[PDB]
Design an enzyme around this catalytic site. Structure first.
Site, short mmCIF file in Angstrom:
data_model
loop_
_atom_site.label_atom_id
_atom_site.label_comp_id
_atom_site.label_asym_id
_atom_site.label_seq_id
_atom_site.Cartn_x
_atom_site.Cartn_y
_atom_site.Cartn_z
N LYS A 107 0.82 -1.21 0.00
CA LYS A 107 0.00 0.00 0.00
C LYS A 107 0.85 1.26 0.00
O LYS A 107 0.62 2.17 -0.81
CB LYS A 107 -0.93 0.00 1.21
CG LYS A 107 -1.80 -1.24 1.33
CD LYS A 107 -2.72 -1.15 2.53
CE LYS A 107 -2.05 -1.65 3.79
NZ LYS A 107 -2.05 -3.14 3.88
N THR A 108 1.84 1.34 0.89
CA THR A 108 2.68 2.53 0.97
C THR A 108 3.47 2.74 -0.31
O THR A 108 3.61 3.88 -0.78
CB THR A 108 3.63 2.43 2.16
OG1 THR A 108 2.93 1.94 3.31
CG2 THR A 108 4.22 3.79 2.49
N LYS A 128 4.98 -8.32 -0.89
CA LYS A 128 6.18 -8.07 -0.10
C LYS A 128 6.81 -9.36 0.39
O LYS A 128 8.03 -9.52 0.35
CB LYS A 128 5.84 -7.17 1.09
CG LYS A 128 7.07 -6.69 1.86
CD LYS A 128 6.70 -6.07 3.19
CE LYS A 128 7.89 -5.34 3.81
NZ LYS A 128 7.53 -4.64 5.07
N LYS A 160 -12.26 17.19 6.45
CA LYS A 160 -13.44 17.81 5.85
C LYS A 160 -13.29 19.31 5.64
O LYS A 160 -14.25 19.95 5.19
CB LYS A 160 -14.68 17.54 6.71
CG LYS A 160 -15.64 16.55 6.08
CD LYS A 160 -16.93 16.42 6.88
CE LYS A 160 -16.67 15.97 8.30
NZ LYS A 160 -17.75 15.09 8.81
N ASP A 177 0.07 8.09 5.78
CA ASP A 177 0.21 6.65 5.67
C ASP A 177 0.16 6.00 7.04
O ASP A 177 0.66 6.55 8.03
CB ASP A 177 1.52 6.29 4.97
CG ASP A 177 2.73 6.86 5.67
OD1 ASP A 177 2.54 7.69 6.59
OD2 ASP A 177 3.86 6.49 5.31
N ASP A 178 -0.45 4.81 7.10
CA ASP A 178 -0.58 4.03 8.33
C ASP A 178 -1.31 4.84 9.41
O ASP A 178 -0.76 5.20 10.45
CB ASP A 178 0.79 3.55 8.81
CG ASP A 178 1.15 2.18 8.29
OD1 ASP A 178 0.59 1.18 8.80
OD2 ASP A 178 1.99 2.08 7.37
N1 LIG Z 1 3.41 -3.93 -8.07
C1 LIG Z 1 3.83 -3.68 -6.83
N2 LIG Z 1 2.94 -3.19 -5.93
C2 LIG Z 1 3.36 -2.95 -4.69
N3 LIG Z 1 4.57 -3.11 -4.16
C3 LIG Z 1 5.43 -3.60 -5.07
C4 LIG Z 1 5.15 -3.90 -6.39
N4 LIG Z 1 6.28 -4.38 -7.03
C5 LIG Z 1 7.20 -4.35 -6.09
N5 LIG Z 1 6.76 -3.89 -4.88
C6 LIG Z 1 7.52 -3.74 -3.65
O1 LIG Z 1 6.62 -4.05 -2.61
C7 LIG Z 1 6.98 -3.32 -1.42
C8 LIG Z 1 5.71 -2.71 -0.91
O2 LIG Z 1 6.01 -1.80 0.17
P1 LIG Z 1 5.93 -2.27 1.67
O3 LIG Z 1 6.70 -3.52 1.85
O4 LIG Z 1 6.33 -1.11 2.57
O5 LIG Z 1 4.38 -2.51 1.89
P2 LIG Z 1 3.23 -1.87 2.78
O6 LIG Z 1 1.89 -2.29 2.33
O7 LIG Z 1 3.48 -0.37 2.84
O8 LIG Z 1 3.56 -2.45 4.22
P3 LIG Z 1 2.91 -2.51 5.67
O9 LIG Z 1 1.53 -3.13 5.45
O10 LIG Z 1 3.78 -3.29 6.60
O11 LIG Z 1 2.73 -1.05 6.08
C9 LIG Z 1 7.96 -2.24 -1.88
O12 LIG Z 1 9.26 -2.70 -1.54
C10 LIG Z 1 7.87 -2.28 -3.41
O13 LIG Z 1 9.21 -2.19 -3.88
#
Ligand SMILES: Nc1ncnc2c1ncn2[C@@H]1O[C@H](COP(=O)(O)OP(=O)(O)OP(=O)(O)O)[C@@H](O)[C@H]1O
Ligand SMILES: Nc1ncnc2c1ncn2[C@@H]1O[C@H](COP(=O)(O)OP(=O)(O)OP(=O)(O)O)[C@@H](O)[C@H]1O
Ligand SMILES: Nc1ncnc2c1ncn2[C@@H]1O[C@H](COP(=O)(O)OP(=O)(O)O)[C@@H](O)[C@H]1O
Ligand SMILES: Nc1ncnc2c1ncn2[C@@H]1O[C@H](COP(=O)(O)OP(=O)(O)O)[C@@H](O)[C@H]1O
Ligand SMILES: [Mg+2]
Lengths: 529, 527
Positions: free
Chosen positions: A338-339, A497, A420, A392-393
């Site tokens: 998501k982030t 991830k 809002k 975020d978060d």
């Molecule tokens: N198509 C994709 N969509 C999302 N992330 C991707 C994709 N391809 C590669 N990634 C990698 O997936 C990881 C997603 O970010 P991250 O691991 O912080 O997830 P998150 O949802 O923010 O985590 P958390 O739920 O713990 O907050 C990044 O390292 C990004 O490089």
């Protein structure tokens, strides 16, 4: 005369126009009619705006424009916070010269100007919003009585200054004292072009600037640059260009061999523009370059749809006249990416102002500090023609913990109101948020505040897993066939991830055991709905 | 895997490119593979331009065709070791200028090259030229510098050397908290008694006097209000106003230069960081291997001159057994390597008497260096030897498969965290039933890791602390781990840090909302 391009101030034509047309039109007309009508003279002005935009220059220029003494100076936290029994003495001393002159020659003298820097501290009883206010009413009462209490004077003019216009008590703004208030703002393209034309004027006169340097183009690459940082850019360029001629030994001496030919080139301007002078209302490739860390790969359908929806929202918020504010919420299971998508969506808006308010920079803060920091981050976005912010978060700002439950009630209520709220007339905004517990926010009633929501799914078929493995390009064809012999005839459940971590753990074994360990790992953590 | 430093002729590369891809379509941003001299290279299209009209008869395009007479220019990618030679090399890049050649060996600073050049180019580049040309340009010399880094890395020495290089008066000195003295009338008097000489000299000699450096210290104590934005504490800021008024504003000076040195870069208010005020900002870090070699080679020059250093004491070898050694601790090691050598040649009988028969041959030998390296200097940002010495008590003895499994898994994780580039951070959680030996199987993995920096955060050193103290201690311990190229950290009895007690629960929600955040925080860069 109003030749406001020779005095030194540029990019402010209407502000001075109004200020003169209203306030100082009586002090320029011949005294005969001024006395005949009996019109009184204004004795107060309040300038407010962002810091470092050229507020003091205007004060000194207005002072010099009407022949008067050298302006005095004061500071806010200095007059206050000194030994008791002496602050009143200082305030009384401040006006001693004017009082003496008035007593000497009555109603015929020269203007005595004052510049009350940072006026929103001592004359402010409105300090109790989240912490507490200060007991300092003596200063404000004395100042009010002196300027206009039960006595009057005709040889004074008070100009205030402040960057927070909503912390001033109305008692200091009633008509008759501190009437005219004006707002200075960040310059636009024409303002920047004019500003860059004054600070580099002596150099061009002495044929010490190369003909390649272009000001018109230089006026389009600095966006949301405050007034005072163009000076920094010019100084940095001058320093860079002139450092080549200091070749020396143990004892540094000027290189007189070629003291001439000291020319500044566009290369130095560009260098100082990319590596140094980092803007204030402009963001860098640091904040949104640590969240995205391994790019974005297309492992299926969801990526395209999410990116398309983001682009549609951006283009809505850039070309609409009836919806200045837009919000969107991203959600999905944990470890789904998501982030890493919010930053990518925001990075392609080409928006002058971009900022990320994340919870990893606020560790151990109390409730009030976190509320004030969030409020400041939001307030620093209404000053740009169009902006974009990320939150975020969310569920780690409210401090939600399943036991209890236990939230913080002083942050949720600020978040809702700020979500809002609409910006001043003419400006635009876009807020993006990411969360991992959709079923909790719905109870709090927050979800009804967000305009729209999107769903980010996980890998759910063997084809998508194989495509992701192929795109990452790690395993060979034989190993891929061996894997497909197993994964294809089943279903999978794993976030994007976790796949990277599993692959990294698997790769460290011996060459002949790189598949069995990976397959074993996928049975325990993955394929476990 | 096939990277080489051998030169490659761009003219031949361009000729082969034309000979191969003639009459082929190319588009901006296209990625392809090109083979030259049995070597494979990755080509990315950057610019495309149309030809000029034929003799009988430079627009930018996105897609076009390649022909025999087309021209090709090759440029190496970012951080590319490829060596390209020939006239088929277009030069569009950014490199600033060639800074004046320097000889750091004479000055006595080693390992700081980029920082010195940048500081000189920015702050001091305009205080060397004659006043004539400076006046003609029109300028306002920089009057502020900020530095921050771990203690004992050579910060003050930089300021003193740069000041003594430019003929100037002896620098003054002030201490941060020392200026916070009880009541007003003394602190303000102290502020006044700093620039009197500068202003008097300016009035006496006009705009031709000499520089007056003023070195601060711990500038994060005064001009510090962010410290109030914490779980406790709180103090009004009043001294920053005086310094701010003096540095910039009325009666400003033209021959002053403040230099602030701190240790916590994030405990600084935005008031003292805006152009016009303290402008530039540099950071000093721990030295690396070549830095340690240069540092050692400078502190052992006098002895080598008079033939007091033996022939078997190599200096290169000593730069590979000292890891994460601060700058000053190398001087400490050198100093301690001489007392032991010279403490042998002394005999005392009713009075210490200098030996006479063996006074000559007073040579420092490898034995002194080795003894000092093992029992003299105790590093600070380095491996400990007592923390993971009392935890593992009676060794580890096999009693089945689980021990082997746990040890193998730990080794695999600790090798992944050292030979990977897509996952700088990995964390593993051990668990099991109580009284099973899950705290003497983690210290063993940490000791077998072989990482230079190994700390142990345990609740045994936080008895009676409140929640805020625990938060501060944990934050400091974790922060200290970001200053090394490798780090391993251990947390023991996570259930005890949170104060869990099942008559409740009564956990602490101010430590559990920091422990969660910390475990997801990528180190600054490449660590
Ligand atoms: N198509 C994709 N969509 C999302 N992330 C991707 C994709 N391809 C590669 N990634 C990698 O997936 C990881 C997603 O970010 P991250 O691991 O912080 O997830 P998150 O949802 O923010 O985590 P958390 O739920 O713990 O907050 C990044 O390292 C990004 O490089
Ligand atoms: N796998 C093992 N094989 C052999 N000896 C072991 C093993 N694990 C621990 N020991 C020994 O047993 C003792 C372990 O005590 P320790 O303090 O680690 O207990 P613990 O049960 O892990 O602690 P706690 O209850 O606080 O979690 C030490 O003497 C250690 O040498
Ligand atoms: N609009 C402007 N045009 C030209 N110079 C400016 C402008 N605004 C600021 N500056 C430069 O910045 C310097 C300091 O600005 P200042 O007035 O102190 O900012 P602030 O009003 O925020 O205190 C001045 O010396 C001036 O030369
Ligand atoms: N880069 C360096 N080169 C040579 N000596 C150094 C270096 N860094 C530190 N030192 C030594 O450390 C000693 C004290 O350093 P000091 O200036 O107190 O460090 P800090 O700036 O952290 O206070 C000096 O005598 C100096 O010889
Ligand atoms: Mg234990």
């Amino acid at each position: 005369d109003w030749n406001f391009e020779k005095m030194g101030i540029g990019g402010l034509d209407k502000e001075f126009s109004d200020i003169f047309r209203r306030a100082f039109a009586s002090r320029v007309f011949p005294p005969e009619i001024v006395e005949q009508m009996g019109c009184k003279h204004v004795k107060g002005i309040l300038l407010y705006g962002p810091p470092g935009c050229g507020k003091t220059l205007l004060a000194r220029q207005i002072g010099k424009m009407l022949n008067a003494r050298e302006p005095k100076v004061v500071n806010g936290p200095e007059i206050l916070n000194k030994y008791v029994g002496e602050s009143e003495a200082n305030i009384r001393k401040l006006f001693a010269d004017a009082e003496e002159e008035q007593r000497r020659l009555g109603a015929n003298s020269g203007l005595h100007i004052i510049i009350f820097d940072e006026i929103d501290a001592i004359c402010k009883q409105r300090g109790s919003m989240a912490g507490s206010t200060g007991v300092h009413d003596t200063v404000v009462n004395q100042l009010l009585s002196k300027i206009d209490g039960v006595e009057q004077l005709n040889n004074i003019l008070v100009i205030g200054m402040t960057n927070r216009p909503d912390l001033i008590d109305e008692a200091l703004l009633r008509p008759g004292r501190l009437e005219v208030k004006m707002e200075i703002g960040l310059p636009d393209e024409k303002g920047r072009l004019q500003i860059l034309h004054i600070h580099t004027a002596r150099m061009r006169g002495h044929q010490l600037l190369s003909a390649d340097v272009d000001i018109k183009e230089l006026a389009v690459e600095t966006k949301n640059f405050s007034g005072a940082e163009l000076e920094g850019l010019v100084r940095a360029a001058q320093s860079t260009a002139m450092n080549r001629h200091i070749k020396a030994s143990t004892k540094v001496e000027v290189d007189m061999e070629k003291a001439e030919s000291l020319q500044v080139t566009r290369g130095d301007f560009l260098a100082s523009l990319e590596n140094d002078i980092k803007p204030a209302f402009g963001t860098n490739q640091e904040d949104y370059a640590s969240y995205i860390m391994n790019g974005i790969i297309k492992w299926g359908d969801p990526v395209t749809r999410v990116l398309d929806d983001g682009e549609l929202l951006v283009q809505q918020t850039k070309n609409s006249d009836r919806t200045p504010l837009v919000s969107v919420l991203l959600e999905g299971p944990p470890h789904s990416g998501k982030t890493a998508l919010a930053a990518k969506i925001a990075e392609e808006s080409n928006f002058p102002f971009i900022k990320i308010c994340s919870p990893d920079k606020m560790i151990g803060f109390s409730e009030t500090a976190k509320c004030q920091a969030m409020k400041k981050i939001f307030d620093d976005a209404y000053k740009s023609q169009l902006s974009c912010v990320v939150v975020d978060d969310i569920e780690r700002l409210l401090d939600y913990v399943p036991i209890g439950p236990r939230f913080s009630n002083l942050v949720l209520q600020a978040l809702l109101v700020l979500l809002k709220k609409a910006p001043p007339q003419g400006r635009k905004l876009l807020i993006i948020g990411t969360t991992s517990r959709k079923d909790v926010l719905q109870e709090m009633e927050m979800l009804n505040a967000f305009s729209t929501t999107i769903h980010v799914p996980n890998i759910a078929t063997g084809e998508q897993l194989l495509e992701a493995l192929e795109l990452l390009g790690n395993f060979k064809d034989k190993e891929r066939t061996t894997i497909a012999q197993q994964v294809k005839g089943k279903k999978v459940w794993i976030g994007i991830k976790k796949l990277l971590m599993l692959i990294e753990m698997s790769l460290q074994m011996d060459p002949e055991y790189r598949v069995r360990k990976f397959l074993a790992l996928l049975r325990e953590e993955g394929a476990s709905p | 895997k096939n990277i080489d430093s051998n030169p490659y002729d761009t003219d031949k590369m361009a000729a082969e490119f034309i000979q191969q891809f003639n009459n082929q379509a190319f588009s901006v941003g296209q990625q392809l593979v090109f083979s030259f001299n049995d070597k494979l290279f990755g080509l990315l299209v950057k610019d495309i331009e149309a030809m000029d009209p034929s003799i009988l008869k430079r627009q930018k395009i996105e897609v076009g065709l390649v022909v025999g007479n087309s021209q090709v220019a090759f440029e190496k990618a970012e951080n590319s070791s490829l060596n390209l030679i020939g006239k088929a090399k277009t030069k569009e890049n950014r490199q600033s200028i060639i800074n004046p050649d320097w000889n750091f060996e004479k000055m006595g600073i080693g390992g700081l090259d980029k920082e010195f050049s940048d500081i000189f180019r920015r702050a001091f580049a305009s205080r060397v030229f004659p006043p004539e040309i400076v006046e003609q340009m029109g300028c306002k010399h920089v009057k502020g510098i900020l530095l921050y880094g771990p203690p004992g890395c050579g910060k003050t020495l930089l300021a003193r050397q740069i000041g003594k290089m430019l003929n100037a008066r002896e620098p003054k000195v002030v201490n941060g908290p020392e200026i916070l003295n009880k009541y007003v009338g003394e602190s303000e008097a102290n502020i006044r008694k700093l620039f009197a000489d500068a202003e008097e000299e300016q009035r006496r000699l006009g705009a031709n006097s000499g520089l007056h450096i003023i070195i601060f210290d711990e500038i994060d104590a005064i001009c510090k209000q962010r410290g109030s934005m914490a779980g406790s504490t709180g103090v009004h800021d009043t001294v920053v106003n005086q310094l701010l008024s003096k540095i910039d504003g009325v009666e400003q000076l033209n021959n002053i230069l403040v230099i602030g040195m701190t240790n916590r870069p994030d405990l600084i208010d935005e008031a003292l960081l805006r152009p016009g005020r303290l402008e530039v900002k540099m950071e000093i870090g721990l030295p690396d291997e070549k830095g340690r070699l240069q540092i050692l080679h400078i502190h052992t020059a006098r002895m080598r001159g008079h033939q007091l250093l033996s022939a078997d004491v190599d200096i290169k070898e000593l730069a590979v057994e000292t890891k994460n050694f601060s700058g000053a601790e190398l001087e400490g090691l050198v100093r301690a390597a001489q007392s032991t050598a010279m403490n042998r040649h002394i005999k005392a009988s009713t009075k210490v008497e200098v030996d006479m028969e063996k006074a000559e041959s007073l040579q420092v030998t490898r034995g002194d260096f080795l003894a000092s390296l093992e029992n003299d200097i105790k590093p600070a940002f380095g491996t400990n030897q007592e923390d993971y010495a009392s935890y593992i008590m009676n060794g580890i003895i096999k009693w089945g498969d689980p021990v082997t499994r746990v040890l193998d898994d730990g080794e695999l994780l600790v090798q992944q965290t050292k030979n990977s580039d897509r996952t700088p951070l990995v964390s593993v959680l051990l668990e099991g039933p109580p009284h099973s030996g899950k705290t003497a199987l983690a210290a063993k993995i940490a000791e077998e890791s072989n990482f230079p920096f190994i700390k142990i955060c345990s609740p045994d050193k936080m008895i009676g602390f409140s929640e805020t103290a625990k938060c501060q201690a944990m934050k400091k311990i974790f922060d200290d781990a970001y200053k090394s190229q490798l780090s391993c950290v251990v947390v023991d009895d996570i259930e005890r840090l949170l104060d869990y007690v099942p008559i409740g629960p009564r956990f602490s929600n101010l430590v559990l909302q920091a422990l969660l955040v910390l475990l997801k925080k990528a180190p600054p860069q490449g660590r």
